[PDB]
Design a protein around this ligand. Structure first.
Ligand code: GMP
Length: 296
């Protein structure tokens, strides 16, 4: 992961947008991929921490441009773009800022009940429209096939951990993968466009109207299992919990809720493995150490 001063951020934009004068810079936020900077208190600029992050930034810019007026909520609108180099697919992107604060579980549970329920209904309508966006014109590259991903994760873990685990420990790893791959329910779904990081940090809230006023952070968006967009909201202290998501599910007219629960239960066991892989692919080593300790 690399880093920026405000000076570098300024000169970068100046190169490509010399007519855009900058008055104020502050850090808005940071994900796994980019630092986000708030320019003119009315524009969010994302600069990539590494080549992987930049590839995700490029994804996000491209998908946003295809869905920009298809959804019932505000999403980030692309106003400025950087350029490709040998290191980054896209050096930066600037977006219109969405005013609001994250809909944290704490905030959500302090709302009046009718507001909490409007939030579930508004999140369901958003998912329902997102999952219906026609995907013909999307890059076949964005398809994430879960069965494929799981087979590739199995090889990656073997090859990462082969000198770190004892043979009986790796055999149990292989058994875990095998059991997952024999269960069809994880792999039979109809691909559609999914947000794929759909959780409280990315759901913006207007505390004067007590209503959701935006969805942000489309860097992980893919064509994949729509159920991903529910399971990411379900974890208890950290996210919303099953009662709230079951309201979303009902508005969405989900027909197979026990399948969503079973996917969530498996994603919960799967976390240690993702920590190891995401660890290395993002070079965050504290995650790697953690998943490995867990696996033992
Ligand atoms: N309030 C607000 N924060 C944003 C916006 N875009 C990015 N961020 C913050 O910067 C982080 C990384 O994108 C986000 O998770 C938010 O915390 C935005 O449009 N409005």
């Amino acid at each position: 992961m690399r880093t920026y001063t405000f000076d570098q951020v300024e000169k970068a934009i100046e190169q490509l947008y010399p007519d855009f004068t900058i008055n104020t810079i502050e850090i808005s936020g940071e994900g796994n991929d980019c630092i986000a900077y708030e320019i003119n208190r009315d524009f969010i600029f994302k600069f990539p921490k590494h080549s992987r992050g930049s590839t995700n930034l490029f994804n996000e810019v491209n998908i946003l441009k295809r869905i920009h007026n298809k959804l019932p909520l505000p999403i980030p609108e692309v106003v400025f773009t950087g350029m490709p180099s040998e290191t980054y697919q896209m050096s930066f992107a600037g977006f219109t800022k969405i005013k609001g604060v994250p809909l944290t579980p704490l905030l959500l549970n302090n709302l009046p009940k009718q507001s909490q329920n409007q939030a579930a209904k508004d999140l369901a309508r958003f998912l329902s429209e997102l999952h219906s966006i026609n995907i013909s014109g999307f890059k076949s590259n964005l398809v994430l096939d879960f069965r494929e991903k799981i087979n590739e994760d199995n090889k990656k873990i073997k090859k990462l951990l082969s000198r770190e685990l004892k043979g009986p420990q790796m055999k149990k790893v292989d058994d875990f993968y095998r059991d997952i791959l024999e269960n069809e329910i994880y792999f039979k779904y109809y691909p559609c466009l999914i947000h794929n990081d759909f959780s409280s940090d990315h759901i913006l809230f207007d505390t004067e109207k007590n209503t959701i006023c935006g969805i942000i952070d489309f860097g992980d968006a893919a064509i994949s299992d729509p159920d991903n967009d529910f399971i990411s909201l379900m974890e208890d202290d950290e996210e919303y919990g099953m009662e709230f998501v079951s309201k979303i599910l009902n508005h969405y007219k989900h027909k197979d809720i026990p399948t969503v629960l079973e996917k969530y239960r498996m994603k919960e066991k799967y976390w240690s493995f993702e920590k190891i892989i995401y660890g290395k692919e993002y070079g965050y080593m504290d995650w790697y150490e953690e998943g490995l300790n867990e696996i033992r």
